[PDB]
């Protein structure tokens, strides 16, 4: 899984990393540019017929459900990008399968004048002109890999063997679902850029902070994202609603409370929630019930209310 | 086409929108309803890269390329929705094929406070039925039909008996690519609150009116109403461009469209409709034309899919 030849690599891009982690700039720069490019930011949606289920608050709801499917990824490569132009690398390499993710760095490669090379296998060159000529548009060199079996894994060392051999200049920019993924703390970190966001846009939608920023905890990472940026505020009450079923507060929300909250917002706002997110909103619901009159809730509407439809009305 | 019973009735809606459309209470209101939900306002970006090749103007891109078509149909018909709420009408219904434009529409109306019943054909019930689950979960009931073909025929014929029977109160709802569109300065109109946003987005990006608002003419119908919220702004120049009232007009050659449509790619690592290009190519020579410092604006109208075959091509 990770040739050793690599270790030195990783550990200077890591290295590099963790001296960005110092302070808010890294992320202050990366949110400056992704203003207006690609889906960033998200909207902060204020949902005022469901006021009146939950006590007089008002609840916004912070529309993670409405970035599609690699403007998304695109936000998270320019991050990717942004780091090798502060590591002062003038090249970046990747592998992609399919496609997509040699688009979207080929993309962040040319948004910040980066050369860029994608490495991809001569199988999947064949069958895909599409993606290699938006690539090619784009500004890339793309390098159909001849070797092996002309596969993924192929294009994968190609770009191994050209990492560790350029890494003076070079940086690699790693995102197939099957490709290697070696920097867990930067993909955490990319997400408080939703929380960021959150925090200017109550500014801005409400005159002050709110009273509780909310989301649906225990779903892998990318709701807790809403947090980090509220940690520091001394009046503000980080709640993280937790499947129950039968720094920040824990709670439960039943299998019911969760559904009343979905059929609820299908209603009231004509949104169709993930199911993750429903506990969310049941939770926004009871906190603002609980806090009464213009309390202003804040709730992550996290990910893809694509059938969890299918049970949902199951649940009817 | 449309049965002439429905004509006393298609002319009060007539009557009630020429109604809205002349006043500013509308679409300021359908601007709010919009505000945050699905899509609207999209964003206006600074392409700051352009400005080198551009005498070093300010070139904002609206940018309608990001819209999911979807998040549009929701966006259009809220709009009716907004209509029929100040018509009086209570209740709303439309028909649908796979049903998209009833999700849309029972979107609308859960968000309106609408009853909301969509015709389906029995067919169509069957081979597309979350989508009909989809609108139950938002409230409105369908009516799966089961008379003659079952479908969309039949599915257009009970809605208009429904609106003709229930015209006192009862809006009716189009989209779907093949039912009636009896309004067409309707569908028009609302791609008004594309230049309406993008009128508030400059000002707060650049501290003021645009110098210019530039577009593509002579396609995509989607393209012209950035220009509508600048009308009483004398002093912001209006430019179509095209391929080769207060608005001037000017050609763009294939030629520079693909400079222009290059660049785009190279610097912004946006990938442009051709059209869209057109007007980056005379968002780039007024910038030379209007000097150090113009602010321009230019609609990035239509999807950078397809277009990429011919470009690719042409290089």
């Given at each position: 899984?990770?040739?050793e030849?690599?270790?030195?690599?990783?550990?200077?891009?890591?290295?590099?990393?963790?001296?960005?982690?110092?302070?808010?700039?890294?992320?202050?720069?990366?949110?400056?540019?992704?203003?207006?490019?690609?889906?960033?930011?998200?909207?902060?949606?204020?949902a005022?017929?469901?006021?009146?289920?939950?006590?007089?608050?008002?609840?916004?709801?912070?529309?993670?459900?409405?970035?599609?499917?690699?403007?998304?990824?695109?936000?998270?490569?320019?991050?990717?990008?942004?780091?090798?132009?502060?590591?002062?690398?003038?090249?970046?390499?990747?592998?992609?399968?399919?496609?997509?993710?040699?688009?979207?760095?080929?993309?962040?490669?040319?948004?910040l004048?980066?050369?860029?090379?994608?490495?991809?296998?001569?199988?999947?060159?064949?069958?895909?002109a599409?993606?290699?000529?938006?690539?090619?548009?784009?500004?890339?060199?793309?390098?159909?890999?001849?070797?092996?079996?002309?596969?993924?894994?192929?294009?994968?060392?190609?770009?191994?063997?050209?990492?560790?051999?350029?890494?003076?200049?070079?940086?690699?920019?790693?995102?197939?679902?099957?490709?290697?993924?070696?920097?867990?703390?930067?993909?955490?970190?990319?997400?408080?850029?939703?929380?960021?966001?959150?925090?200017?846009?109550?500014?801005?939608?409400?005159?002050?902070?709110?009273?509780?920023?909310?989301?649906?905890?225990?779903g892998?990472?990318?709701?807790?994202?809403?947090?980090?940026?509220?940690?520091?505020?001394?009046?503000?009450?980080?709640?993280?609603?937790?499947?129950?079923?039968?720094?920040?507060?824990?709670?439960?929300?039943?299998?019911?409370?969760?559904?009343?909250?979905?059929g609820?917002?299908?209603?009231?706002?004509?949104?169709?929630?993930?199911?993750?997110?429903?506990?969310?909103?049941?939770?926004?619901?009871?906190?603002?019930?609980?806090?009464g009159?213009?309390?202003?809730?804040?709730?992550?509407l996290?990910?893809?209310?694509?059938?969890?439809?299918?049970?949902?009305?199951?649940?009817?």
């Amino acid at each position: 899984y990770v040739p050793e030849a690599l270790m030195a690599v990783i550990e200077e891009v890591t290295a590099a990393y963790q001296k960005e982690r110092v302070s808010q700039d890294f992320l202050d720069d990366l949110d400056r540019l992704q203003a207006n490019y690609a889906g960033r930011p998200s909207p902060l949606y204020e949902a005022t017929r469901l006021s009146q289920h939950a006590g007089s608050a008002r609840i916004f709801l912070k529309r993670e459900d409405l970035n599609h499917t690699g403007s998304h990824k695109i936000n998270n490569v320019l991050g990717q990008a942004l780091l090798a132009r502060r590591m002062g690398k003038t090249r970046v390499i990747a592998e992609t399968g399919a496609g997509q993710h040699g688009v979207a760095t080929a993309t962040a490669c040319a948004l910040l004048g980066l050369d860029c090379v994608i490495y991809m296998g001569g199988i999947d060159t064949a069958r895909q002109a599409l993606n290699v000529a938006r690539m090619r548009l784009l500004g890339a060199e793309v390098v159909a890999v001849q070797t092996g079996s002309k596969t993924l894994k192929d294009a994968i060392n190609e770009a191994f063997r050209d990492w560790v051999a350029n890494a003076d200049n070079t940086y690699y920019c790693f995102g197939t679902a099957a490709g290697p993924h070696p920097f867990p703390t930067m993909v955490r970190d990319f997400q408080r850029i939703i929380g960021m966001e959150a925090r200017v846009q109550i500014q801005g939608q409400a005159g002050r902070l709110p009273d509780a920023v909310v989301a649906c905890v225990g779903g892998g990472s990318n709701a807790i994202g809403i947090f980090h940026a509220f940690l520091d505020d001394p009046g503000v009450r980080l709640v993280g609603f937790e499947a129950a079923g039968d720094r920040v507060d824990y709670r439960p929300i039943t299998d019911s409370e969760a559904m009343d909250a979905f059929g609820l917002l299908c209603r009231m706002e004509g949104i169709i929630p993930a199911i993750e997110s429903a506990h969310a909103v049941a939770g926004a619901l009871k906190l603002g019930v609980e806090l009464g009159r213009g309390a202003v809730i804040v709730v992550n509407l996290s990910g893809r209310g694509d059938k969890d439809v299918e049970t949902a009305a199951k649940w009817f």
